[PDB]
Write a protein that binds this ligand. Structure first.
Ligand SMILES: Cc1cc(S(=O)(=O)Nc2ccc(Cl)c3c(Cl)c[nH]c23)oc1C(=O)N(C)C
Lengths: 322, 760, 52
């Protein structure tokens, strides 16, 4: 089937991976004993460019990440090695999850999540090796370990939206959502404890600037209940809220975030737009414990599916979780 | 690497064709679209007297001549494949001819995935708005108001997410679209002010899976005709008509034209070259029954265009474009169609091997061209460029020259249809069955693959070698292997089976033309398919799948392998260095094997070429040109840095070394032939400053920035063009007037004239 | 059948274009501009307008 497909390419002149996607992967290596300490190194998945095979140490714990060069048929060559969450004591097993920006491929972001009411979440960004060191290219290699926790109504991971915007990563803590922008070099995100490292040492924060933008959820909900709720004039109290990111537009730097706010508290679903450019506008209101949270999240995912717009292949956010 | 790209031959494939009144209301015009080429022809009594051919800085993918109310003549809307839209208005004020660009702007959204079917551009019949399919699940809409200084295009979410093709219906009080989505047909009316997809005129309906075309039937008939294999269906609310003539089953219909203004007569074109006349019976104003009529055959049609006096312009892309005349009477062979004039077109250049058949260092380019029934060898020599065509009536793959016997071995494939009567009969009596002598492999070791040896003077097929059944011939080259001085015709086949997607068996077959008789000297069976071959210091370098094995020609008259390496498709050899162009691994280097350096950046290369020992070039599937060098660093040398980037705009299929008059010849599906020539650093700097200043003084039709047009562009990344000189721009410099030369030279005549003269 | 239409009988009875390099400049009448607001954003704001 493949040969006539190439013949069609030779004549039509139109060749795209989408119509070369029906073919199975030609190369399939066992990767048995080929990876060092076949245990000592667990690979997640192929990189977006494909020239790297990310793998991390099983292991307090250290979680040493190691990038491996990928050849058609040969031993993989470890090309990078970092301990990810260094200034982070670990007493649990974390399901490692690493992603890359849709187009800003210079650096990747890894999120470690584990199995009570508070769950440990660890995030750190590392610069992929550019294709004394006395090499400015290597000097780029940086590290930004960060750690926080969330309340029992754990926020949805939604990794793609969390990183839809280039140069920026959205983290939704239980009480605020932070837009960290680790830009290395005029300014962005304008019109959290993030210890930085790199080469196994901590420099001052070629220079990299982390632009952090946060909205305190409780304050913005007080504003919305004060100014933009017809039944807000009779609002008594709100206890807990879940924040779900519907969509992130990087062109206009807007993120649409939903809140399933809960004489008794009644279930609602209040829509919010945040202009990252500079500044909160209420898009749509709503009307009148774990089960309602789940139903609300189900509603959000229905909305996202009902307005899914396939991102151009190559502008997707690859999620890499073994 | 500092290279100079110029177009020796302008592309000739017809991308699109629109009939209207651009130059003047009274004068009928047939605009012809070729990659970055807009040809305007005024139909006259003598014929199509050409008017002007203005060059777009983009691949013309959407071309519609529409008449807004109040405009004396129809305006022109062009949308390049680089997503640049423009509105052109012809203006022959006095002697001066100027194509004023009324509107100019980019419409790229850089959000949705390019649609699987080709870009699609509709215009509202009442000229209210322009509909543009750009990405899956989206619909770019442009208002057509004249008052506002800035037209505010917007998008509306198409829910289907897989639409074959759309069209704007006729007579609806509001602009309603009618399309087919993967299959069913649905209609949603469009509101310009509300910017939403309101319910359409009629409900959705189910249609055959092969339905792939909607035609907007004009009033008074109304409704739309969905075209698909054994699926000629007419949709108009209650008026749901359908028809499945057996004549349609032969091939998918690919073209449609409105012969009758009322819509009673429509023209159909298919891949097989047949031309069907589609009739709508006129009942009182309704349709009783649909009918189609075959009128004969023509060259493979990309777009049909009915002209006055019952003549049609069969726009072609897989071959030669014809001016077929529709005779009211039937021909003796039952062909209502008669050819009158046939416009030349190199079409798909599958391969080319420059040869100096005569003396005087005048390299003459023989080129395998066309496909299916229109496959033919082309012979072009500098004058201007006289082109001799030798039809083969079958698809040629590649050609190699054997000067020993003064013959041209071409790999030809012809399509045959299976039947229970015997094995299988051929569609047409092509050259494979018209060869003087015929033989078959028949060695133990639908498409019929043959090796057609052809004379270099009379150009007549001397011998044909039909391979085994299901044997897919892939690669061919001629060289004198080893010590043996008899030049051999070494070819690579694939034992492709329908059950297996990827091949597993293939045979490297050594041939030699003995005084008119092709002898199978050797036949080495190789696991997998032989994708490409090339001589290497007297040893054949095969390419079995991803593996790349060199072979030795023993005195025992057999092939023995030397070493392996680890989907290789493109093998070019210079000295001891082997350049391997994989399909996704881009460029790789080798030596005699040991890997040297690979360009890690993924690119779907279509052809590769080794300019110099350290300047390696290839063209990807994005119609773009990149040259990568080998930096000489214990391991960084194993990295190939892409020194120069360029967006050619054509799918180069082959890279051949030589020159008609360094130099590299390349061939494109559109039929463009271009010259890649190296430059010195000082000369490159001078030429780049030259081009920069020229861009400032030369205007751009459609206000398209030349830097943007030539800038590298792929689905992942876009970078400005480096290491490459557009060439054609510099050629324009000589054509402009001396007062404008005075401007372009600015601070720094005859010397620039001389340099561009030698560049010509 | 074959009662084909003719826009003008004279054409096709007695039976390459020069490149147009623009030197002078005529100002463009209008400019295409694409709306950048996201489709969810526009739709939700429009529904907000309706209930406001
Ligand atoms: C169209 C899509 C986008 C993404 S996302 O990568 O942004 N992830 C993601 C988004 C939103 C939510 Cl609410 C969740 C939750 Cl809960 C878990 N993951 C989520 O996922 C999808 C998708 O296929 N489904 C959701 C089914």
């Amino acid at each position: 089937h493949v040969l006539k497909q190439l013949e069609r390419v030779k004549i039509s002149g139109q060749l795209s991976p989408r119509l070369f996607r029906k073919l199975p992967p030609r190369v399939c290596v066992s990767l048995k004993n080929i990876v060092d300490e076949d245990a000592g190194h667990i690979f997640l998945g192929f990189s977006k460019c494909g020239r790297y095979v990310l793998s991390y140490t099983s292991s307090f714990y250290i979680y040493h990440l190691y990038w491996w060069e990928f050849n058609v048929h040969s031993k993989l060559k470890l090309v990078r090695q970092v301990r990810l969450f260094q200034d982070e004591e670990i007493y649990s097993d974390l399901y490692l999850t690493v992603c890359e920006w849709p187009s800003d491929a210079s650096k990747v972001i890894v999120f470690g999540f584990n199995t009570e009411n508070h769950r440990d979440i660890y995030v750190s960004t590392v610069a992929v090796p550019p294709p004394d060191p006395n090499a400015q290219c290597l000097r780029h290699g940086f590290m930004l370990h960060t750690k926080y926790q969330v309340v029992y109504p754990f926020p949805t991971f939604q990794p793609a939206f969390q990183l839809k915007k280039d140069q920026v990563v959205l983290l939704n803590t239980s009480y605020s959502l932070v837009a960290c922008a680790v830009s290395v070099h005029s300014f962005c995100q304008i019109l959290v404890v993030t210890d930085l490292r790199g080469r196994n040492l901590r420099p001052m924060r070629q220079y990299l600037t982390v632009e952090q933008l946060t909205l305190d959820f409780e304050y913005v909900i007080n504003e919305v209940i004060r100014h933009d709720a017809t039944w807000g004039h009779q609002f008594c109290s709100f206890s807990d809220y879940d924040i779900v990111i519907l969509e992130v537009c990087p062109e206009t730097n807007q993120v649409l975030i939903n809140i399933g706010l809960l004489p008794k508290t009644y279930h609602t679903s209040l829509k919010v737009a945040w202009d990252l450019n500079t500044f909160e506008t209420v898009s749509v209101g709503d009307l009148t414990s774990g089960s309602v949270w789940s139903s609300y999240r189900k509603s959000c995912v229905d909305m996202v599916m009902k307005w899914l717009v396939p991102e151009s292949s190559g502008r997707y956010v690859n999620r890499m979780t073994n | 690497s500092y290279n100079y790209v110029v177009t020796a031959q302008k592309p000739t494939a017809v991308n699109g064709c629109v009939t209207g009144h651009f130059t003047s209301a009274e004068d009928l015009n047939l605009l012809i679209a070729k990659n970055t080429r807009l040809e305007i022809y005024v139909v006259t009594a003598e014929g199509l007297r050409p008017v002007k051919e203005v060059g777009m800085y983009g691949k013309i993918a959407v071309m519609e001549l529409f008449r807004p109310k109040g405009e004396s003549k129809d305006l022109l809307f062009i949308l390049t494949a680089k997503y640049n839209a423009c509105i052109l208005e012809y203006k022959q004020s006095g002697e001066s001819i100027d194509i004023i660009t009324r509107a100019h702007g980019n419409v790229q959204d850089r959000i949705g995935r390019p649609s699987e079917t080709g870009i699609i551009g509709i215009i509202d019949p009442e000229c209210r708005m322009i509909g543009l399919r750009l990405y899956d699940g989206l619909f770019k809409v442009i208002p057509l108001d004249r008052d506002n200084k800035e037209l505010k295009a917007f998008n509306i979410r198409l829910e289907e997410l897989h639409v074959i093709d759309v069209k704007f219906l006729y007579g609806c009080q509001a602009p309603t679209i009618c399309f087919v989505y993967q299959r069913h047909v649905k209609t949603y009316e469009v509101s310009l002010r509300e910017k939403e997809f309101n319910k359409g005129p009629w409900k959705q309906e189910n249609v055959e899976a092969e339905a792939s075309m909607v035609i907007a039937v004009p009033e008074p008939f109304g409704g739309a005709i969905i075209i698909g294999q054994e699926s000629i269906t007419y949709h108009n609310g209650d008026k749901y008509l359908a028809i499945a003539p057996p004549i349609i089953k032969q091939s998918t219909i690919v073209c449609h034209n409105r012969v009758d203004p009322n819509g009673s007569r429509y023209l159909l074109g298919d891949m097989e070259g047949r031309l069907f006349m589609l009739l709508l019976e006129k009942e009182e104003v309704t349709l009783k029954d649909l009918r189609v009529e075959l009128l004969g055959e023509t060259s493979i049609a990309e777009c049909l265009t009915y002209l006055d006096n019952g003549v049609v312009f069969v726009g072609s892309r897989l071959g030669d474009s014809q001016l077929v005349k529709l005779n009211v009477d039937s021909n003796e062979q039952g062909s209502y169609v008669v050819a009158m004039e046939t416009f030349t077109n190199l079409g798909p250049i599958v391969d080319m091997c420059v040869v100096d058949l005569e003396r005087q260092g005048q390299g003459q380019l023989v080129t395998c061209s066309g496909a299916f029934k229109e496959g033919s060898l082309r012979i072009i020599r500098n004058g201007k460029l006289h082109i001799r065509t030798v039809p083969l009536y079958e698809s040629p793959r590649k050609i190699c020259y054997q000067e020993v016997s003064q013959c041209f071995g071409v790999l030809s494939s012809r399509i045959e249809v299976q039947d229970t009567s015997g094995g299988t009969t051929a569609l047409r009596p092509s050259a494979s069955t018209q060869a003087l002598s015929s033989s078959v492999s028949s060695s133990k070791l639908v498409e019929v693959h043959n090796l057609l040896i052809i004379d270099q003077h009379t150009f007549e097929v001397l011998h044909a070698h039909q391979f085994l059944q299901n044997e897919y011939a892939l690669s061919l080259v001629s060289c004198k292997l080893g010590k043996d001085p008899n030049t051999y015709f070494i070819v690579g086949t694939a034992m492709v089976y329908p059950e297996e997607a990827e091949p597993k068996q293939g045979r490297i077959v050594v041939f030699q033309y003995s005084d008119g008789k092709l002898q199978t000297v050797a036949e080495k069976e190789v696991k997998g398919a032989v994708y490409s071959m090339v001589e290497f210091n007297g040893k054949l370098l095969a390419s079995i799948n991803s593996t790349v094995r060199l072979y030795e020609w023993t005195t025992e008259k057999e092939l023995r392998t030397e070493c392996n390496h680890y989907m290789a498709l493109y093998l070019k050899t210079k000295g001891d260095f082997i350049l391997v162009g994989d399909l996704m691994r881009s460029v790789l280097l080798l030596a005699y094997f040991e890997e040297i350096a690979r360009d890690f950046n993924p690119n779907w290369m279509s052809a590769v070429e080794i300019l110099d020992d350290d300047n390696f070039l290839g063209a990807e599937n994005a119609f773009n040109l990149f040259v990568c060098q080998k930096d000489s660093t214990d391991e960084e040398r194993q990295h190939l840095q892409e020194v120069g980037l360029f967006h050619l705009g054509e799918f180069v299929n082959v890279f051949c070394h030589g020159s008609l008059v360094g130099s590299v010849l390349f061939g494109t599906v559109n039929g463009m032939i271009g010259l890649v020539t190296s430059l010195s650093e000082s000369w490159y700097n001078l030429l780049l400053d030259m081009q920069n200043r020229l861009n400032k003084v030369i205007k751009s039709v459609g206000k398209i920035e030349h830097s943007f047009w030539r800038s590298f562009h792929t689905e992942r990344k876009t970078e400005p063009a480096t290491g490459f000189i557009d060439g054609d721009l510099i050629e324009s410099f000589l054509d402009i007037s001396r007062p404008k030369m005075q401007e372009v030279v600015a601070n720094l005549a005859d010397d620039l004239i001389k340099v561009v003269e030698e560049l010509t | 059948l074959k009662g084909l239409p003719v826009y003008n009988k004279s054409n096709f009875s007695r039976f390459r274009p020069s490149v147009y390099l623009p030197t002078r400049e005529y100002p463009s009448e209008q400019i295409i501009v694409t709306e950048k607001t996201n489709i969810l954003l526009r739709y939700l704001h429009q529904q907000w307008d309706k209930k406001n």
